[model samples]
Target chain A: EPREEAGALGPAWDESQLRSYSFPTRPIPRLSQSDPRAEELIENEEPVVLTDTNLVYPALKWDLEYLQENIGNGDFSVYSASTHKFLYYDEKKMANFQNFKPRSNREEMKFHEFVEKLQDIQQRGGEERLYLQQTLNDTVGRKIVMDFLGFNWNWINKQQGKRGWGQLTSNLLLIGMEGNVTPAHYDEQQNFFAQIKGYKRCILFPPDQFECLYPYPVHHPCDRQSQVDFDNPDYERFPNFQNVVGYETVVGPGDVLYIPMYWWHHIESLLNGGITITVNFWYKGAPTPEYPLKAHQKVAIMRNIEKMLGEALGNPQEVGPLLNTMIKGRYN
Target chain B: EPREEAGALGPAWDESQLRSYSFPTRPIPRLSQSDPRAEELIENEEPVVLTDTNLVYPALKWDLEYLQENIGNGDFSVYSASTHKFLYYDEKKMANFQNFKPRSNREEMKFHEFVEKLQDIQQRGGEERLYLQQTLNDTVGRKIVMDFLGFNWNWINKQQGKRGWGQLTSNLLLIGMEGNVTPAHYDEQQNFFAQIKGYKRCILFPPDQFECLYPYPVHHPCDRQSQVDFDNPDYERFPNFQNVVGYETVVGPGDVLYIPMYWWHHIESLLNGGITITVNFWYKGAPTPEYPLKAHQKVAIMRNIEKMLGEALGNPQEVGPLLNTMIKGRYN
Candidate 1:
């Protein structure tokens, strides 16, 4: 749904507003587009940073003046965490964590209130579905600010193809106080994160670096945590993780960070810093044209074979070593 | 280790005599105890059937005397069409299939020659380190008999808690002449097939079963099949499927079949047929349950949600609609 310009937050701000809030850049080793390192990494199935281009878009702006004047006073709701109703992971018990939706005042409220509200919502229930977010069209002030940042919502939707882009739906994360961090995790799609306010320290590792991340098994309740701790890893438990090296970046307002699919990242707000808000844009990826001969494909194949055998044999246990005996000394 | 008597082919054969040529009695199916049906089909969830005590362990038997003495000429190999190599599904390319270990020719000239001449290697490589499959004791005769019946070694390994139970694998199959048919279709698991002595027919289906079986996307692949006519499928439009479901499944004495994961299958022997000897086992199942929600678990959850949402959202497209506007939708 489109909104009128008159109803938007205000007219687009000048480029000076963006430059005013920009923070000092940090130097990190990244496989930039023109570097041979990028080609090597790509050939080796590693990650690389695409070049910065005019098409790049930011998710939010830093100007607290505008936030305080606009979004802070607008309608906001506490997170609702109960969308998945029939939880099946638990063996001992079944749970329906879709009842609690904590109420919070996002604007003008102390940063702690925001965190407390999120925690309350998480604690009261568990995980919930995120709410639908109305884009900048909701208010005149937000529309102007978003346009100036070159965040073409239409292009985003169009690039996605299926739904046509610019359908901004993610939350504007507000990380306040030092040491405040987001749990390490990977998203299923692409993301463009723009530091709108204060400084945010980011630690990133490629998806191929699976050994170091030590992801939980496919079915665990703690599905995202890595067993190895970057600060002091458990060598005995995760010996392969010792070789892991990471890239770190501290971003401030106006800086755009692009996160590709399946990459693991951890974000933290600097301690002693004031409120730090980050607005992130995520886009769906195109389907793979050719399936790779990798672990993922094997997993897909096994699931099908199991079902066929289970139905035909009328027994599930007889599926394992059976294949082993057949393939052991036979395959090339 | 070879059994002292090699046990009768079926239960009907009396154990006292211990004749190598006797067949066993057919066991009865005990419906009073076990029913194939379950409470409800969990979306994306496959059922695992446990053995029921009331059911007889061994069911059918064949007279070895007839197979060995009357049909004196001991030739044991599945008759083949023009193709000799196995085809990889995704790329539609031929894999090394001339790997069966050759057999000896003294005991039964035809059978021995076929077995001894069989190549002893596989074209496909071993699974990656994450999926380690233990090489069980090698008893070629036993392995041949089992493979003829379409048994899965991996299934056994998983049931026995051998390595790589949850990795790619599938169960064995036994296709006899009399037009006894297995349909054309691909499975999601890596497969190994051992052929004892028989002429059975097999036709395969590819992973793209969309127009084939009209399969529900969330369900296992076996649940669907393309409606294409196998004998003379129209290629004018399905040119994309030129190499899609190439057919092959003939293994003779000592000849083994190595079917990769996700390749479809169909098997049959001509009607009014000669006795076909065969055994087969499939592998790949839910990985050793490190957590309650193995790969299968998430599939199950997704299935349920899809089924529910298909109802709640009232259509498939609505599923995306709700997701698109949700905050988490951005991440998708």
Candidate 2:
């Protein structure tokens, strides 16, 4: 049966408008198992957009109205920003922090009310921006939970089983208002990011560029997040950031992007576009053999070495100065 | 089935006499499938010595006397040196050189005659050192070839299949006279080195030490082989060689050492030991994913970049100076 083509109901942006940082433009490969290059993509660890598979779920039929109606009247955590950016915030902070505050304001509102607020913000062009970020579970709604449970578990389970990675840890459902950005960050687990509605531009950097992207302190709430703002990078603060090269791609509904573990990614909904929906599945990476250590492992080793040295010196802040003292003239 | 313990038949050297560099001393893990840590060993990429399995073949019962009696007379390539070093030689080299010669003298003689010559050299206490390095095949003897075929193929195949590496490429049989040294070099393939008759000490350096190892030019006969002599220091010629850290291990009869691909290794028969017999299995490494590129891949990328720049500049010799000019002040 032929289904109606989903109408493009929102604004669209080209590659230039989507990217904040300079990056080489290339198409993220779209492939399936039958494609001869599928194995090659997996072997090369390239981020690929998987298409034409049974990834379609009945939940993909979801729209703003359907979600508002079926997702029950439970209050969801909605982040509202005075500006277009809804940067991530850490709820927990070290006791020693003298002045730490939430970067974005979060409010609990009913799904229906959130959708109405989003629509109002979309039309009135107010300063307020709303992003509905919630973890999908039984609390969302019986129907929504049922739909989430209706995902192709067998397909995902088979993939996990084949890869020997540990079980799926979490599934996050994200609905972002237009122009909302997640900021540049990396997660510690492999992710299967599935786009359900609206378009998202994803810019990625490999682990090898760790030095070019100065990550926040491990104990900070923004740990694993790059310090340089992509929108307006401070070259003086992070001169090495000028040398960073990124890979970018645009993902649409029904496209599943395989984000390798520890890959740095900056994600954003197209400017002026309406609410964008996505569900991401995070899986624990498999226990891999250690010989010929991978680039990420090198990063981990460096981190561990720093941690050990910091502990030994009785001050985490001393690591940099000690290393500089040791290497400044001798190594060069 | 209980088997007789192989007798110790070779002389041993102290650690200080055997190694020219300092290294951490640790036992190479010996494991079996039933051991709880077997998977851990594999996952850690630690070199392991597998023991107490059906790796034993009928050929294990064949010693020098049995080999001389049963094995058919066949011409085998032998390397003889006045000293202990049987350094590798390049059979293929540019024809323009007037003084190009092999690093080691190579000769072909019957296996029986080679054994007799080894015995003569041993008895006479002469400087002549002989190494009978041959690939086990049909030409050696029908009985020997049949015994080689009877090796625990199922065991080897099972291990390879479990690891997902491709098929085994070749098996090399090495019979080294006491005090023989193969020199420091790295092979591009994974190796399962099985020591059968005498003790051999292996000194290994990870691929990250490529700069310190000072590999000869790709076109040179000693390509992939370290230029710095382990016994004699030439700090003025290769200054970085002093910073290299190596891992060392000694294997005896019935021990199989897992050598990861591209690991630099220096193998030598224990000084004053009798003729040492061994066989090594080389297998093709699997095509692995590259999000976090492996150390070997990084080395390969560096090599290719150098090659490309050298070609572009029309002078391979300028690569080092060019890289120094670009990175010495800038990168630091």
Candidate 3:
């Protein structure tokens, strides 16, 4: 049985309707060569250049050759499904109601068996069903491609007891063609993404801009992204929405973009474009100096506030009930 | 009018009364030389040891001569009181409660005026009223002592901005024939203490042990430290009484101790001690990193939780009320 939309956000508008809206104009400041701040900024932090850096991916560079020689004769599987179309972890039982594309086929196996069975799946489908598998760590021709693009690779069998490493736990998609967009979202750590074959535009804002983006509760699946559409945000519904400032970039092959930890980014392949392939490197950040007040300090504060409220009120659901009583009418 | 005791531990129990009654027994762990964790503990962190190593402080090394030549002769017109105490910034007015003793009888002025004032104050014996004074950063004596102490003297003035280098904002006192003990407390930033003469024992605890020590709220003037007596802890009052673990050291003449940021320490002048005079170097720590959670993060989180609960319940006093409600009556 398909679940009904909870309507936390208002009705979804189609891509065509979204494309027709004009985004509000805001100043886009560029760093000038003569600016003194640019030297400090460049020296202390690395700026992201999203361009054609993906062409150097090892899968394209060498995996094609290996696949053609070793597994080209075997049967493979192919499928086309959008990210929002399925709760990928439990597709059949929890299909995405708002955007279900039908889970037409599933190659079933246990966790480890899935990776062991990947060669057979790829052999049958050419390059269509290729997956970046996850165990404690991962390895494949796709991984080599990722490594060539400066992605850090650690092939391990278990997740526990590791420092300074983030595991790839999802099948990250690089949807090709028009109007295919990732909802504005925030990830847990830093990411270095290299666009391998085609262009994908991105819109990003820092996590401090939370007021401009309404995050769902921790108990909800869409935990860190807003339900509001950026193109046509409901001013009456989210009045403080106008405060959002975003940086946009169109990445192509060979270019690496550094996505700072906890930053919200919305990504989409260009409209009227051919298929695109991109690889991303998610690296854990180093520790910060100890200080009294900081952004991380604020996050820690938020967590404690939520935990205490949740525990005192008896379960996480009451967080909203309590916050609504405190903040809703006061802020509005 | 003096403030009444806001509250007490239900009647006064003297040292003799509490000495006969053992509160409870708990093992106190000391840092061992062979522990690998000890090596990890000090890496990249510089904690100044307050000891008489170089005897660089002329105040202690040359004693009476240094005093005759350099002491301010009762002018009390130049030093500034600590901002939190004097200005009462952020509505904080509990300086006297925190055992912060300001330098009162020190300042540089006309020699004739200094002598007249000293003589007049002496004739009206015990009529001395203390006023904070700011020091002259560029004084010859100050420069000589700061240089001899191996400090970058100019940076001190630059960092403090307009305050001279010898301005005494905090001081220690030895009471009666026994050591005057300041109750366990943590200051806002790093402190460099140069013990000119006499011995003082200092005990420290990391911020992670907050469960062991109770902290007053921001609304209270005694904003940082707890009122609970460490010498004879009231277990019934603060039930998490068994959690504290501390580090202790005895510092003496010419010793320089660097008290790291936010660490709680209890200082006691030795019994039958000579008057201990000391100079301190206080510096603001660098900004803290963004993640993996820190001890201070938990502190901030606890505060936020209190605030959120207070606001939600519509009573500022509910901060403690809710914590007590949730935490109390949980264990048998």
DockQ of each two-chain model:
0.03, 0.01, 0.02
True-structure Cα RMSD, model 2: 16.2
Cα lDDT, all candidates: 0.39, 0.70, 0.46
Put down candidate 2 lDDT per residue, B87-167, tens digits, no spaces: 675767334233556656879888789878978977897877788887766667777777777877877787787777887
Q: Quality of candidate 2's docking, in CAPRI categories?
A: incorrect
Off by over 4 Å in 3: A1-47, A50-178, A288-297, A311-314, A325-332, B1-304, B307-332
What lDDT tens digits, residue by residue, belong to model 3 across residues A125-229? 433332222221233345443444443232211211133445544323232333456657777665655566555666777666565666544444455556467
- Give the per-residue Cα lDDT of candidate 3 at B206: 72
DockQ of 3: 0.02
Shift of residue A22 alpha carbon in model 3, Å: 5.3
Give the winner by lDDT: 1 or 2: 2
Better of 1 and 3 by DockQ: 1
lDDT of 3 at B313: 49
Descending-DockQ candidate ranking: 1, 3, 2
Cα displacement (Å) at residue A183, model 3: 1.0
- TM-scores of all models? 0.38, 0.48, 0.38
